[PDB]
Amino acid sequence: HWGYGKHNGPEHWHKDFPIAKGERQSPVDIDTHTAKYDPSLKPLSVSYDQATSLRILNNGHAFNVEFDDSQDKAVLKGGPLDGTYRLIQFHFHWGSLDGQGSEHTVDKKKYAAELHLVHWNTKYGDFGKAVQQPDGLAVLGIFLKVGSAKPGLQKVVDVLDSIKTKGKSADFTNFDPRGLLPESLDYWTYPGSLTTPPLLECVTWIVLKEPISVSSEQVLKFRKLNFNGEGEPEELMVDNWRPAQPLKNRQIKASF
Numbered sequence: 591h592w593g594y595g596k597h598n599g600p601e602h603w604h605k606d607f608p609i610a611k612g613e614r615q616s617p618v619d620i621d622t623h624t625a626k627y628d629p630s631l632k633p634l635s636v637s638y639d640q641a642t643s644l645r646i647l648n649n650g651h652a653f654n655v656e657f658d659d660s661q662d663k664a665v666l667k668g669g670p671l672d673g674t675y676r677l678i679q680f681h682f683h684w685g686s687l688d689g690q691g692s693e694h695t696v697d698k699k700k701y702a703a704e705l706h707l708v709h710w711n712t713k714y715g716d717f718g719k720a721v722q723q724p725d726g727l728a729v730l731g732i733f734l735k736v737g738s739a740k741p742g743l744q745k746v747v748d749v750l751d752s753i754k755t756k757g758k759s760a761d762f763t764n765f766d767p768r769g770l771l772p773e774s775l776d777y778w779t780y781p782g783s784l785t786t787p788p789l790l791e792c793v794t795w796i797v798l799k800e801p802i803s804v805s806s807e808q809v810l811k812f813r814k815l816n817f818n819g820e821g822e823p824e825e826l827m828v829d830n831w832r833p834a835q836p837l838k839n840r841q842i843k844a845s846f
């Protein structure tokens with residue numbers, strides 16, 4: 591089954607998921623000199639005050655922090671979005687070394703990691719119905735660079751020991767995702783896809799310009815995770831990122 595290695599990685603995904611060669615695939619390179627300021631974009635509203643995390647899961651490719659989305663709590667609206675999108679989970683993509691890890695790139699620059707906060711459009715009733723629509727999802731993308739520690743990330747970091755191998759989960763209630771946001775909300779936005787199979791083209795991407803800093807010690811703990819299940823040969827969970835895909839004359843808009 592699909593992964594990130596030589597034999598099941600991004601170059602292979604098209605065989606089981608033909609949309610891998612589609613018209614609105616993610617991630618993409620953000621050419622800052624081609625992206626245009628869009629005066630018509632409303633302000634972005636990120637309302638994560640009443641967010642309810644439930645648990646953290648190693649799913650064999652990354653870890654998902656999952657939220658209770660059975661009610662309008664943590665919501666994304668404004669910007670390029672119409673209506674309300676509900677936070678369902680967040681996860682990261684990261685590298686084996688600080689010079690790679692992000693999915694989106696900025697003028698070809700790769701960051702050490704990238705955070706994806708995944709939201710589904712409430713007009714569609716549930717996540718499963720949302721992923722059958724071109725405007726079903728909104729993902730908030732936040733770059734990670736290595737420098738000073740991110741205090742709001744440390745609760746995630748310390749729990750990773752308990753979810754080392756594929757299929758392990760842990761109770762992870764009362765996590766506040768506001769602690770992962772950079773100061774500025776300037777962003778780029780384009781229509782795209784989820785970056786893991788089935789790579790559904792349902793996403794309005796909102797990628798923040800300002801990276802957060804995490805410490806080397808913090809990213810190193812990400813890298814101690816396992817792709818394999820308990821008691822199998824150890825495959826370190828690293829380089830779980832899909833490279834940049836053809837823009838196919840979509841248009842990236844700047845909020846600034």
Ligand SMILES: COc1cc(O)c(/C=C\C(=O)O)cc1[C@@H](O)CC(C)C
Pocket residue numbers: 647649652654678679681708709717786
């Ligand atoms: C919007 O995404 C989701 C929607 C979802 O409904 C679920 C649900 C269950 C679970 O993972 O056990 C997960 C996710 C994420 O877990 C994506 C995963 C392939 C990294």
Ligand SMILES: [Hg+2]
Pocket residue numbers: 649650651652
């Ligand atoms: Hg997986």
Ligand SMILES: [Hg+2]
Pocket residue numbers: 721722723724725726790791792793
């Ligand atoms: Hg879709």
Ligand SMILES: [Zn+2]
Pocket residue numbers: 681682683706785
């Ligand atoms: Zn992602």
